Design a protein around this ligand. Sequence first.
Ligand SMILES: CC(C)S(=O)(=O)NC[C@H](C)c1ccc(-c2ccc([C@@H](C)CNS(=O)(=O)C(C)C)cc2)cc1
Ligand SMILES: N[C@@H](Cn1cc(F)c(=O)[nH]c1=O)C(=O)O
Ligand SMILES: N[C@@H](Cn1cc(F)c(=O)[nH]c1=O)C(=O)O
Lengths: 262, 260
Amino acid sequence: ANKTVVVTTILESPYVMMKKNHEMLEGNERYEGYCVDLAAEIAKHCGFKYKLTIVGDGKYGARDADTKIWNGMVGELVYGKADIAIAPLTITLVREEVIDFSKPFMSLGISIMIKKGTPIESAEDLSKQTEIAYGTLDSGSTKEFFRRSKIAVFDKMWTYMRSAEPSVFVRTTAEGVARVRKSKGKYAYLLESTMNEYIEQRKPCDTMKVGGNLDSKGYGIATPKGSSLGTPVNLAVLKLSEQGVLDKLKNKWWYDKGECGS
Amino acid sequence: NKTVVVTTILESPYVMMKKNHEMLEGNERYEGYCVDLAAEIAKHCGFKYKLTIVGDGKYGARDADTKIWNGMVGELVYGKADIAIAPLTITLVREEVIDFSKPFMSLGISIMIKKGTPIESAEDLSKQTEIAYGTLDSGSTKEFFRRSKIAVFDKMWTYMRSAEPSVFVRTTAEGVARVRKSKGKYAYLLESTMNEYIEQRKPCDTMKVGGNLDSKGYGIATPKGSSLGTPVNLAVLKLSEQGVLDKLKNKWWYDKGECG
Ligand SMILES: CC(C)S(=O)(=O)NC[C@H](C)c1ccc(-c2ccc([C@@H](C)CNS(=O)(=O)C(C)C)cc2)cc1
Ligand SMILES: N[C@@H](Cn1cc(F)c(=O)[nH]c1=O)C(=O)O
Ligand SMILES: N[C@@H](Cn1cc(F)c(=O)[nH]c1=O)C(=O)O
């Protein structure tokens, strides 16, 4: 019979955030954001009840080279702890081999965040100098993009980042933002364009996205391989796209209440 | 195994007839982004294939009366082709009847005008009557307008469906020619990918205006449940991650730009 769907997700703004009065709230009511709204829409169109659960290790999902064990949200799906992931989870080949993904609900590419006034306009620019350090989220699809790239500029960037001291990798997007804001232009952060565009709209309005994106991809709703939820969830994503709901939700969480002007 | 029958469509710069194609044979008759993409997918999946241009020259729509699918979608649904490798938009009604890979290219509906036309947006088009406008007479753009509940787009559809003479065209080439020859009195609604290609082609007399009206993707399609779906999708993800899709886009779009 019908069972409550366990949703794995991650505290990443503005996708899932603690509500102001979270300390006296319980269950799903503790959270707000794009993916909270998206989970409600998907659940409504698919006819299920659900419980939002923040991934224990705070990771997206990577496979350890030695143990072959998956961590993060991907791990929660692979090992049967969650029924679905509704999060800014990038569709990647290695993940697609072990979990199912809907068609993407949001587009993005790796991008560059600078402190305003930093003399950098492109990845090439970063790669041709050493005064400004740069890095990525310490686990996830961005780091993997650099590790795997055969493109010379990106390989050069990876060769620098992997050996940089102190480490240029950060544990959370928030840590990356802090490092940009505090480093007087001497750190630049490589992060997904969606997060970058969100942060550019937040006080104190001291960061900006520069240059084109380094790649082009999408976030997808993920389920364990072969789950019966996969098909209706995908149809729901396509419906929400075609109805304009995904556009409305992006505007709601990114731009409608932006803090850095119009 | 056997030779995979690929349905596709003549649409620049995805599939085009080569110069001197009349003395060429088979796959060698054709060139373009989807020709290259088909070669890459087939190499990764280890199959031989035959490119075939869809008989009716359509993308795929379901007749409201007979419920029969035409175009490339129809070729898959009725067992005439094994796979479609083309700028085929992923849509809900199609996803219900065929399988799609993850998308290989992003696009949105967009506006093409003859340069100097006093139009900057869909809202602009919707608020006037001097300039006619239309879409490809079958496909996802037409369906977008037919189904939209957004006020500006519904207003546009209400005009287009009843316009006389017809504002709909059989091919993109026909829509572009109509823009070019109508002295600013016809604007064309078409996918941003095609728009951006045409904008950089002689005679350089058209431009894209405004933002895109939606955001979606093209996918590789197979008959529902086909065993080809899984390896083809993995191939699309590999080509994406390797930077090959970007290389192919750069090759077929901005490399052949003729307008500076
Ligand atoms: C891993 C890659 C193969 S990928 O990310 O899946 N695709 C790569 C390719 C360059 C690309 C990248 C991004 C997009 C893209 C386009 C639209 C969207 C959303 C708004 C809608 N997705 S959809 O499938 O078209 C829709 C009908 C629901 C999300 C992603 C489309 C194509
Ligand atoms: N979406 C990524 C995780 N992720 C998140 C970010 F904000 C970022 O900048 N880079 C990144 O890899 C994934 O799914 O691994
Ligand atoms: N990709 C569409 C077909 N298609 C092509 C175009 F060039 C266009 O402008 N509009 C459109 O619907 C589909 O798959 O129906």
